[PDB]
Design a protein around this ligand. Structure first.
Ligand SMILES: [Cl-]
Ligand SMILES: [Cl-]
Ligand SMILES: [Cl-]
Ligand code: NA
Ligand code: NA
Ligand code: NA
Ligand code: NA
Ligand code: NA
Lengths: 125, 8
């Protein structure tokens, strides 16, 4: 019934740094992914209370969303780009796991993921 | 599905 605490976006014990690849990922999020027409269901944690999804956090034990990722980038939470890419993969996979093929939300995730992977394939360095 | 269409 209740929502879990959302994923942390800062941790005083976790080392932080800025890298040009992490800056590129933030640029991709802000310029391209955040304002995509299909972005809005991914811009914040799934609110199982509002949506009355008592099973969501029984099925999804590693939640992730683009609002969390964006804040992590803005707070320099990550040590490397791979951590951030893994968070994106987790977000997309969670959507595929909870929902079912043919759902419009799955089509939205697939389109966002296709665009994200295009941007990954253009990562600098 | 999550009922997102019902939100609005
Ligand atoms: Cl709650
Ligand atoms: Cl990096
Ligand atoms: Cl839905
Ligand atoms: Na640094
Ligand atoms: Na760097
Ligand atoms: Na549910
Ligand atoms: Na890593
Ligand atoms: Na709508």
């Amino acid at each position: 019934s209740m929502n879990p605490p959302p994923p942390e976006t800062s941790n005083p014990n976790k080392p932080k740094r800025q890298t040009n690849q992490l800056q590129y990922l933030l640029r991709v999020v802000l310029k391209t992914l955040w304002k995509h027409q299909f972005a809005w269901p991914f811009q914040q944690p799934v609110d199982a209370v509002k949506l009355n999804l008592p099973d969501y956090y029984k099925i999804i034990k590693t939640p992730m969303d683009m609002g969390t990722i964006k804040k992590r980038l803005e707070n320099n939470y990550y040590w490397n780009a791979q951590e951030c890419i893994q968070d994106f993969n987790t977000m997309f996979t969670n959507c595929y796991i909870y929902n079912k093929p043919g759902d419009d939300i799955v089509l939205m995730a697939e389109a966002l993921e296709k665009l994200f992977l295009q941007k990954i394939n253009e990562l600098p360095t | 599905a999550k009922g997102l269409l019902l939100k609005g």
